[model samples]
Target: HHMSELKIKAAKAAIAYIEDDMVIGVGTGSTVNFFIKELAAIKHKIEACVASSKATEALLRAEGIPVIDLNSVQDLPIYVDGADEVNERGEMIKGGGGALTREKIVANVATQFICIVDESKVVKRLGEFPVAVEVIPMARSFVARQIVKLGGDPEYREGFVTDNGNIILDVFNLSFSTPMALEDSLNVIPGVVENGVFAKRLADKVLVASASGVNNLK
Candidate 1:
């Protein structure tokens, strides 16, 4: 099977985690986009959905699924999203779609985070994919300087402004001996909104799909 087919397979597998009458937390990205499409088939089974980004919100609405505000929903049973890269420990590098800030927020509130991905996303370490750091517009340069001190080369994601009106700095060439600590360190920098390092909010379950089949990881 092709990669697209594998993504759809993992996405379809994610459907099993949804429960009737529960509010779903939807994420952004191409793989999660597949999940959104799969979600359309069971639209009536769920009460509503809270999207992590405007793009995802539009997709949900386009499918005729009710979209709810995150503030309106107190608890989310599951947050399903895709990872740019995932490690053996379930920590991930996300934000390839520029929705890191909102994605992290939604994942933080959820009881279970289910990461759906194709096999190519699985990795031994998390830093291969550039870590995306969402920053306040004014602090873009300042935060880039801070990232440099931590041994990363930060590049501005030119021509892109996030849904929150913030900017993204994709940090590259950093090695992580301690991913969780590095994740916290980045968040402590002034003017930094959120980074793509997901160690702090590691996935509770990961569903990976390949040509052969889908495998569940915990």
Candidate 2:
């Protein structure tokens, strides 16, 4: 299967959602990188972009798209992102690149969220990929223990810190049947900054690309 080609298709479809002079929120990850590259061709049409990570900023800069600080931007008409796993309900498992905190922050300002993914990323259930949680530096063990109590096998992402200078715990085997509940439960824990559960701010629409073609799911 040409999964790589599918990624390009999904990314291409997302660009249609962008309008001239709109400050868009761009996401990170392999699939999103494809979107960035495709966006480079029409970089002048948009005003600027709110990058969710330093990596995303660099890519945007390379494409001549101005990167603006989210603190100065109060609104985003569209937020385009790629998920590790997306369920039928448009809920997603993100942060595979360890950018969950900033990604969620940027997504919060958007009026519309569009998730782009190869059809393979759409699954019957979420959590097949580990849930990533961003935690404070000193609370690594503390957060891990808490996740363990909740039936997760939390593993430290070694030698890695987020753009916000925090550690990431990839929690495995946690049930995502009710993602919003889990999203809140993890956030309420002390020292937990954010997690990969996207239920609370799920995609308004999804662009799924398969060998057949690109399908837009609302």
Candidate 3:
């Protein structure tokens, strides 16, 4: 099947964390797709799950896994998602799949956040990848300018509408040393809705897959 193999390996590693009868929180992305596949393989164990995207809902339904609303489940056990970039401390940069809004909702509600990625996705520091910022369409220009003022070359990507129908400003070609500070600064900008800075809410555990084996970053 010409598989990249990260998905399969990562899925297996993450599935180890899934406990019986627990309400799992599923995220959206190519990496999450791997987790879904593994969940389907062992659908008998899980009781119910809250999906962060409609795509996830469909996949869960097809596998006969119960997809419930987050409100229905008061306390989610664990949330296993993928990241665009992960630091040693389990800090992440997500929203590469344009599911940031929903991802944040799921992660914030979960007791534990586990990130899965390939070796190449890990970074010594954050802000290496283009930060995906979701913003109101009307305020895109203003927001883009503000991102530039913060030291990123903000480029408004065309035809890239988020799942929520919002516009995305992918601030590219810039690296910031103080990721936490930059994230806080970007958040205060008038036109900015939300940026792909997941570092502040540091991950409890990170499961990184490589050709050698799965590495756990605590």
Candidate 4:
């Protein structure tokens, strides 16, 4: 119920960014699901869309909306997605869907990326949510230990393979005031594939939706 309220407000606020007859990239996750449902309400007015995940594609198709594959589209005006946690600089912790690799690809292709989240998802530091790091299965244990050496408590999650066949290690308690530094640090680790921190590609806009209404970080 709480998350729903935030999604509604965030989705409403996000609608302003949508213009008629333009292709936009829709992302996965609970918050983005809210955006998709709300977008369905005005489906007839939209030109077309590209979804970042198979689940999102199914949702958009069920609504009688047209969705294109990312490979088919050259560029998108904006990518609207949700974050597990977003810092003050708008760097996000994504990949909760286990589709971070694809989601990150989609986000990178867009000129602008908008992240929507409830107030509770915001944190004083980036590590409270247990940063999800996608990795190669062969390097699982090595990656976990590497994350621990970097000041995080790495927890191994079994059977958590991504759609792209990557493994995920949930690293907890990483302390970072600036998200970019942490992102750069983890990305360089050997055997490490990708971290949840989205610092290098900062969000163009962030919407913190709560019961009080939507807070825009433009």
Instruction: Order the candidate numbers by TM-score, best to worst.
Output: 1, 2, 3, 4
Clashing pairs in 2: none
Write the residue-wise lDDT of candidate 4 on 107-138 in tens digits.
89899998888888786566667778888889
Highest TM-score, which number?
1
Predicted candidate 2 versus true structure: per-residue lDDT over 66-89, tens digit per residue: 899998998789999999989778
TM-score of 3: 0.92
Q: Order the candidates by lDDT, highest first — what do you get? A: 1, 2, 3, 4
**Candidate 3 lDDT, 99-173, residue by residue in tens:** 777888789899999888887888887777888888889989888887787778887778988767789888886
Clashing pairs in 1: none
CA deviation > 4 Å runs, candidate 2: none
Q: lDDT (0-100) at residue 40 of candidate 3?
A: 89
lDDT score, candidate 3: 0.82
TM-score of 4: 0.90
TM-score on alpha carbons, each prediction: 0.98, 0.97, 0.92, 0.90
| Candidate 3 residue pairs in backbone clash | none
**After superposition, which runs of candidate 3 have C-alpha atoms over 4 Å from their true positions?**
1-3, 173-175
